[PDB]
Amino acid sequence: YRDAATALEHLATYAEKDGLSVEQLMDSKTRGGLTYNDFLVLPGKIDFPSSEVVLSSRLTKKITLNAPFVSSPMDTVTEADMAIHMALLGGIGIIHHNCTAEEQAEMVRRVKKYENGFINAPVVVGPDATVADVRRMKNEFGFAGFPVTDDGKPTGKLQGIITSRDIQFVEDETLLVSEIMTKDVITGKQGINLEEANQILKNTKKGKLPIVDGCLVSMLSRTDLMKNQSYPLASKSADTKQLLCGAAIGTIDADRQRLAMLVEAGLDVVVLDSSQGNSVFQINMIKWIKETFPDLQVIAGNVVTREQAASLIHAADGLRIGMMACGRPQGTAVYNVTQFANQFGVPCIADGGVQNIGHITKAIALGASTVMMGGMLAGTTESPGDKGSIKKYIPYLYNGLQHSCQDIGVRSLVEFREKVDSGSVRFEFRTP
Amino acid sequence: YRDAATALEHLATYAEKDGLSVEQLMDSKTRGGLTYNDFLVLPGKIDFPSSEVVLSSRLTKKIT
Amino acid sequence: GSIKKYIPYLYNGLQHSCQDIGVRSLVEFREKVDSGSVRFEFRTP
Amino acid sequence: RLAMLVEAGLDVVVLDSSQGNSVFQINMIKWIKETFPDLQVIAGNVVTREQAASLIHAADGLRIGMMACGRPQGTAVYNVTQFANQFGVPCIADGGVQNIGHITKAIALGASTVMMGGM
Amino acid sequence: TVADVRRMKNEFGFAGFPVTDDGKPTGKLQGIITSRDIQFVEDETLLVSEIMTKDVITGKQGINL
Ligand SMILES: Nc1nc2c(ncn2[C@@H]2O[C@H](COP(=O)(O)OP(=O)(O)OP(=O)(O)OP(=O)(O)OP(=O)(O)OC[C@H]3O[C@@H](n4cnc5c(N)ncnc54)[C@H](O)[C@@H]3O)[C@@H](O)[C@H]2O)c(=O)[nH]1
């Protein structure tokens, strides 16, 4: 028999590495169209803990996410609650367009204002406002920390602040806010930095830090600091410290106005929702959105072929992949589209057919940047209307992906993409 | 990364179009006998409404 | 149900499938498929 | 834990890992050989040729068998066993064995012994 | 230590702990420490006395509920 010390040396003797390369596995001529279940990714070398794995994924060319998890823009999956929690857990949610423009615009607004660094146009109450009116406002707005202004206007002179603790055990509901409102409120001078303002609030050990000019400009909340502390992988705007929000719109002329209202609500990413996205209408819309709203990131699709991706890219911040009579197997569609699309630096979303961690790992291995979940997320508490809360569930998927990455021998999604493309990562076709 | 304006130009770089031709798909020697459920037709370019589609079919040489 | 409702449904459905494919007529579809313009993918079980 | 087991007259030690191609298991194999030389060490689980080479370079025997990450057992046993058999390292075919036919097929593919746990 | 108070909160489930000189429930009251006090404390090695509220509002014994 051969010596044990010659194993690595003898290993080089073989013409090719054990298993199949991505190019060999994804052969339309020999193996045909494939799905996630049709193949497996072979294990490599484990020299790092699963903890060290980085799951940062690029949703668009200008947008990067901590976890590559995207909520589908479906009536039964993504709403204001689902979008907020998905962003909070290092993922983003696309709001469903199966509603009026006003209704959809409000949902984007709610997600944008759930967490803030500097509160803009903060809700304020009049000095003559009744205690009952403040209680009526809390259920309506969902928050009870309202500063008091002389004219009842957001930019009015600041006369004090009223909170939940102030009216919590008030026997008389007919009393004015002025009598029940805190007389002296700790505030920060206008022009102060967010870090400097946060320091003043931390020392003060108070719930709110209104910012004045002595008129009211913006307000800081202790709660936001707690939200940031509790969720450190949350997907939010670095400049505003607000959760990133995505919405789904049509390719019709009527959606041009609907998009305007959504953009006005602070919408960060727009996804063009089409079964077949390779149309003149969607191509014309992409150009219109770029000219009309340049700062907005546009995700174009759905595209299942290389030609479709080229056309949408020539117009597209990101690409949505996934499509009875007309369509393509998801595994084959992701690799072919992603192979061409990846060259131009366009991140691609693998949409549909994702029910487990294995599907997520396989989809990314095939060249996908992020994966869209719509059947899995459905039945969660955060979903409109049982798999439990996404708070517990999203952390589970994130941990699972790290372990699968460790078994493969890749410390990051970026390394995984490079190793698979380099042929280092090996695959095996699975028989029925 | 490659420029976005070079996508269509770069598209011609590939030896053959994405997907299989009818001749390639209908191979008795390699894929064997096939049925309707066994294959799918890939989407192309949509520059017309569905309304404009004409479904006129020839039942016989003299009947349409 | 009645074929009056059902036949119109099949006719509309065929038009949509033709639109997704990128062919404006059955004649064009036949020519494009024969020309190799139309592409197909084998489906695994 | 191994020291106490060795003290009890333990003959063969199997390193229990879903993926056995790690620095920790590689370091453990060397530690066990230096600390308890008489003990026979079975390393794994390995489903690929590269994994087997790494564990062999460290392994008295190899344990073969591994959703998102894994390999079909028939393909894994032949590929691992083909390389491993050259160095005189007996390989155990672990998992998927429910009948005599599986046992016969596993050995035919180059496996030395078969592991039974559901049966 | 501030860390000990944090360790106590998970163990007891509440963080509103008054401070006594001898550390006994019936000891002289020197102040009270709560969740808001240690919520954003960068240094975990600090004593409770420095981070504990200096003046605490209390009720005389024999007072009705
Ligand atoms: N509020 C608000 N939030 C928005 C808005 N838009 C978005 N949001 C978001 O919604 C979230 C608000 O959540 P929250 O602040 O936890 O809920 P809330 O209902 O606003 O809090 P409250 O119950 O009012 O606090 P509570 O009165 O219980 O303690 P505290 O304020 O310390 O009270 C303790 C005592 O100290 C006094 N006090 C409080 N602050 C004071 C100050 N600066 N100076 C002097 N005194 C002060 C008070 O009067 C009170 O009696 C934030 O994440 C925020 O970003 C908006 O328009 N308004």
Ligand SMILES: Nc1nc2c(ncn2[C@@H]2O[C@H](COP(=O)(O)OP(=O)(O)OP(=O)(O)OP(=O)(O)OP(=O)(O)OC[C@H]3O[C@@H](n4cnc5c(N)ncnc54)[C@H](O)[C@@H]3O)[C@@H](O)[C@H]2O)c(=O)[nH]1
């Ligand atoms: N605590 C406790 N609970 C038990 C025990 N056994 C059973 N329980 C039960 O457990 C429950 C306790 O729940 P809880 O009180 O809501 O939770 P907790 O962790 O104790 O509250 P905390 O977060 O400490 O309040 P927090 O500090 O956020 O606000 P506050 O105390 O106003 O802080 C605001 C600021 O004001 C200062 N402050 C607070 N009180 C002060 C006072 N009297 N005088 C002067 N200053 C005061 C504080 O230092 C803080 O900075 C109660 O139902 C209680 O009956 C026990 O042994 N201990």
Ligand SMILES: Nc1nc2c(ncn2[C@@H]2O[C@H](COP(=O)(O)OP(=O)(O)O)[C@@H](O)[C@H]2O)c(=O)[nH]1
């Ligand atoms: N008011 C407020 N401040 C925030 C928020 N998120 C972060 N900060 C500030 O940012 C600092 C911590 O930065 P870090 O958490 O690393 O930034 P992140 O990566 O955006 O979460 C703290 O000093 C906070 O004052 C927020 O949602 N609201």
